[PDB]
Design a binder for this molecule. Structure first.
Ligand code: HEM
Length: 137
């Protein structure tokens, strides 16, 4: 289920983080609008870029902590508040996060592996609600 999925993703986190974030940026190419230096790069080129590796690993390091601290796929209000309050997320709306979780669920569905895709779908929706409650537009 959900907790085991966190362990699976942590076990190869750099590769899952890059593959899932690339699935997001390829499904919703307009989200590259939020990351200038990503436009006109292939996936291999992005994976070469220091900053891409470091942003995407920090995103998934913290996401896995938020999933880990959740009860039954409901994240802590404190985690939502932290994500809203981050200066790096100043321009963002809940829709950005919704799209990341849609791509993550599709990635899991397409994988040969027994991820609990329905639990990640619920976790995404719960996180979007929490972010709205914590003040995200
Ligand atoms: C649960 C989801 C997410 C988590 C846990 C998260 C976490 C983080 C973390 C920890 C950083 C600091 C990393 C760094 O600059 O070293 C960061 C930066 C950033 N995040 Fe998020 N993030 C999430 C979703 C998103 C989404 C959906 C977007 C845009 C669509 C976004 C845009 C950014 C941007 C632009 C930065 C700074 C730019 C850069 O990477 O150099 N994040 N995020």
């Amino acid at each position: 289920g959900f907790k085991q999925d966190i362990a699976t993703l942590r076990g190869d986190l750099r590769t899952y983080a890059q593959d899932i974030f690339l699935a997001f940026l390829n499904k919703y190419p307009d989200e590259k609008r939020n990351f200038k230096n990503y436009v006109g790069k292939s996936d291999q080129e992005l994976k070469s870029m220091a900053k891409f590796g470091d942003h995407t690993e920090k995103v998934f390091n913290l996401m896995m902590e938020v999933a880990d601290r959740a009860t039954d796929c409901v994240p802590l209000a404190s985690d939502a508040s932290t994500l809203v309050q981050m200066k790096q997320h100043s321009g963002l709306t809940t829709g950005n996060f919704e799209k990341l979780f849609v791509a993550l669920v599709e990635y899991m569905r397409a994988s040969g592996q027994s991820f609990d895709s329905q639990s990640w779908d619920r976790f995404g929706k719960n996180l979007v609600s929490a972010l709205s409650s914590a003040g995200m537009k």
